């Protein structure tokens, strides 16, 4: 059944009366900051002021039944004015891969809170929400509320430091759920379901390369299912229930596969385990022979998902390369290999496309391994030293100035795109540009 004409209006009106103008304003501030990650505090606050204004008036028992329609329409028109007071999209708000929000020291927090409680609370909800806005709305509302409650009680406590430790430990579960859901949902948003599923399988393969496909494939699918369902859900506890539940399945499956997972699964709480497994770097890949692309048959025969997942798993667990690189070349490669099945002379298409893709893949991997050379096996300062020595030998001609410049650009690239959790959107475009230099 299709929702009634006044679904939206009646939905908002209900939450306004149920929460109260103050709590409704807080809800709106979080909701719109989340919607416009790039909006300034001024812009978002003004928009929220208008929204709350029309909501209060248009929801009044006995108010113009058509009040909400126009007021909201005029609001959208007011956003048209170039350089309007409201924030705007270029619709779609890109995920924030580089949050800049920094929590002040306990002393700074309390001084600021004492000077202007209301301003402090609004500024916090705005800055936090615009930085971690991909986390489900319900988690953001709950987290900011609990955080502010902690600030209120601890700053006026007889022993602030003790109170802060106590409340931060109690806030831990929710803090992690909020921060982690923002990150995995940001990567899901950037990738889309199909690529997210591939990426997650790749990361599991690198973390536990000694496992069987049957141990990791269901885990990759479960996390993908949870993200497609819970990230943009309005449910008040989709993510809060699913994430922790995923952690139990992860440990039941991998707690004995290697020392690192055994240690992670010894953590006391579900979110403690998730954080440990999320931050876990790729393991040292065992040495194994090369893996050839799937045969013409295994590619064209109906129901090939398992064959492709297995290839993904086999290639990932033996190829020393970051996930952002593997995900980037693996999807076009498998897609192209499948373009052959649609032709009358499939075999002919395979004899010319098979060798071509095999070389394009080997090449990509080689250029990627060069771009990330020495990064994962050394401390950063030591890595930069070996880089300078490698580039010098490669460019005996370059001046000291030029070499220094190259070292800085390459090491900067590596510090951003050669790790297991490198940012997908940023690295996709950076890898393209950096590949043309080799």
């Amino acid at each position: 059944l299709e929702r009634g004409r006044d679904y939206e209006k009646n939905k908002v009106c209900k939450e306004f009366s149920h929460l109260g103008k103050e709590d409704f304003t807080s809800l709106s501030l979080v909701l719109y900051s989340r919607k416009f990650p790039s909006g300034t505090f001024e812009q978002v606050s003004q928009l929220v002021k208008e929204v709350v204004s029309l909501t209060e008036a248009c929801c009044a028992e006995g108010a113009d039944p058509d009040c909400y329609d126009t007021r909201t329409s005029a609001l959208s028109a007011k956003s048209c004015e170039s350089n309007s007071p409201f924030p705007v999209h270029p619709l779609k708000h890109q995920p924030q891969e580089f949050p800049t929000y920094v929590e002040p020291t306990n002393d700074e927090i309390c001084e600021a809170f004492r000077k202007d409680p209301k301003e402090y609370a609004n500024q916090f909800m705005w800055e936090y929400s615009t930085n971690y806005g991909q986390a489900p709305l319900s988690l953001l509302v709950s987290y900011t509320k609990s955080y502010l409650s902690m600030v209120g009680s601890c700053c006026t406590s007889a022993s602030p430091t003790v109170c802060f430790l106590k409340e931060r430990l109690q806030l831990k579960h929710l803090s992690l759920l909020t921060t982690l859901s923002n990150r995995v949902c940001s990567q899901y948003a950037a990738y889309g379901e199909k690529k997210s599923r591939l990426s997650n399988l790749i990361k599991l393969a690198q973390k536990v390369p000694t496992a069987d496909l049957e141990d990791v494939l269901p885990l990759a699918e479960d996390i993908t299912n949870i993200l497609s369902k819970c990230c943009e859900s309005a449910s008040e506890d989709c993510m809060a229930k699913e994430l922790p539940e995923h952690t139990v399945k992860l440990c039941d499956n991998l707690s004995t596969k290697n020392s690192k997972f055994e240690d992670c699964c010894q953590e006391k709480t579900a979110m403690d385990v998730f954080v440990c497994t999320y931050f876990m770097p790729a393991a040292q890949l065992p040495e194994l022979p090369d893996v050839e692309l799937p045969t013409n048959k295994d590619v064209c025969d109906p129901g090939n998902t398992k064959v492709m997942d297995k290839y993904t798993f086999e290639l990932s667990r033996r190829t020393h390369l970051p996930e952002v690189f593997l995900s980037k070349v693996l999807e076009p490669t498998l897609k192209s290999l499948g373009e052959c099945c649609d032709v009358e002379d499939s075999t002919t298409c395979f004899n010319a496309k098979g060798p071509l893709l095999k070389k394009e893949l080997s090449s990509f991997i080689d250029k990627g391994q060069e771009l990330c050379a020495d990064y994962s096996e050394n401390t950063f300062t030591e890595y930069k030293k070996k880089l300078a020595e490698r580039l010098k030998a490669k460019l005996p001609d370059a001046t000291p100035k030029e070499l220094a410049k190259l070292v800085n650009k390459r090491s900067d690239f590596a510090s951003n795109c050669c790790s297991i959790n490198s940012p997908p959107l940023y690295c996709d475009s950076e890898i393209d540009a950096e590949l043309k230099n080799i």
Partner: protein, 349 residues
């Protein structure tokens, strides 16, 4: 009783006390003296008629029989308590072997009969002492120095950096350079004298090179120190050349990176989205971070290595010498920590 005990077993000093207190009640040298037996200060004062051994090296327990002697002394002689009556929180160095933790636990339950206990990571307790659960700790004591990045209580194991240079090496270096200046410090007694000079007169120069130039002439940096026999000596640039070794390990022939670089490298092993929270919560803990000027120098060095738009904040409280113990005191006192204790029941299981 109902008061939990907190014991921070350091390479050089044992810090022990009761949960809830703002400072350790007992602080003594982690040494055991055999007749050629005593423990702590009494062993040091009688070192002439005994042989000294240090059960803890580089923060890791290496001699269990001697460690039991230190713990027994801590409970009965220093704290004057009966172990059987108090839950006990112990500390361990970052990356302490699992088998080590297991042995500590076994000894506490079977030898001392404690009713409950817990083993916490020293660096994490230093962070908790400041009422935070995320940040990077530079912990430098008498035998070892570590950088430990922590996110909501979880210390990232692959990002932990360890520098085999600490207080003891700084004392030996000050002895060396004071000797090159004309004085003579070689005996064990003279080593204790030098340690006192180090703790009282050394400091970290903001700009090492410039400070060296300033000392080359003026005496505005020189200070006097009265020896036991009353002789008054002068300490000049040795004041800041000593701790400079933390930033330049080459001063003692070590090829390793200095503490500003291990801090930076530690942060770089962490995901890009949480680095900002490490840079903004860099905690210093331990006796070897007590040098005046060290925080400002670290601020400067890290700023030069990090992105220009990164906020750098160094947290170095006046009581940081005991931050580990203090963090343990607060943690062990939390109502929500009472479920973390490993009970004797659960152990006999």
């Amino acid at each position: 009783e109902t008061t939990a005990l907190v014991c921070d077993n350091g390479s050089g000093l044992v810090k022990a006390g009761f949960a809830g207190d703002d400072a350790p009640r007992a602080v003594f040298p982690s040494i055991v003296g055999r007749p050629r037996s005593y423990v702590g200060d009494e062993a040091q004062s009688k070192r002439g008629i005994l042989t000294l051994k240090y059960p803890i090296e580089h923060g890791i327990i290496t001699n269990w029989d001697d460690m039991e002697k230190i713990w027994h002394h801590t409970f009965y002689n220093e704290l004057r308590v009966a172990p059987e009556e108090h839950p006990t929180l112990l500390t361990e160095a970052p990356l302490n072997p699992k088998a080590n933790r297991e042995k500590m636990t076994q000894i506490m339950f079977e030898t001392f009969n404690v009713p409950a206990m817990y083993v916490a990571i020293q660096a994490v307790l230093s962070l908790y002492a400041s009422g935070r659960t995320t940040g990077i700790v530079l912990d430098s004591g008498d035998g070892v120095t570590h950088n430990v990045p922590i996110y909501e209580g979880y210390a990232l194991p692959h990002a932990i950096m360890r520098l085999d240079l600490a207080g003891r090496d700084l004392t030996d270096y000050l002895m060396k350079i004071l000797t090159e200046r004309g004085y003579s410090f070689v005996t064990t007694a003279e080593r204790e004298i030098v340690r006192d000079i180090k703790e009282k007169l050394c400091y970290v120069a903001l700009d090492f090179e410039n400070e060296m130039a300033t000392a080359a002439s003026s005496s505005s940096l020189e200070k006097s120190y009265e020896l036991p026999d009353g002789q008054v000596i002068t300490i000049g640039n040795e004041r800041f050349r000593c701790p400079e070794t933390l930033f330049q390990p080459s001063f003692i022939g070590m090829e390793s990176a200095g503490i500003h670089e291990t801090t930076y490298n530690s942060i770089m092993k962490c995901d890009i989205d949480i680095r900002k929270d490490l840079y903004a919560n860099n905690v210093m803990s331990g006796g070897t971070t007590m040098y005046p000027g060290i925080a400002d120098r670290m601020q400067k060095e890290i700023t030069a290595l990090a992105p220009s738009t990164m906020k750098i904040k160094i947290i170095a409280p006046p009581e940081r010498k005991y931050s580990v113990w203090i963090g343990g005191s607060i943690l062990a006192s939390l109502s929500t920590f009472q479920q973390m204790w490993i009970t004797k029941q659960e152990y006999d299981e």
